Amino acid sequence: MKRTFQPSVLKRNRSHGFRARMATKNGRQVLARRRAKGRARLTVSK
């Protein structure tokens, strides 16, 4: 069976990376929430 996670680094970064989160207001709010929570890894880039 083909499973749902089919990894690809380029797609991962283009979809959830830091510069994708920074491009929109809601993405920046995601980053603000994650900084307030105290997350060690902010996005999938790291």
Instruction: State the minimum distance, in angstroms, from the CB of residue 33 to RNA.
Output: 9
Distance separating alpha carbons of residues 20 and 11, to the nearest angstrom: 11
Show the site string, 4-43: x = touches RNA by CB under 7 A, - = not.
xxxxxxxx--xx-------x-x------------------
Distance separating alpha carbons of residues 23 and 13, to the nearest angstrom: 13
Instruction: State the minimum distance, in angstroms, from the CB of residue 37 to RNA.
Output: 11
- Which residue type does 4 have? T
DSSP character at residue 6: -
Residues in contact with RNA by CB under 7 A are: 1-11, 14-15, 23, 25
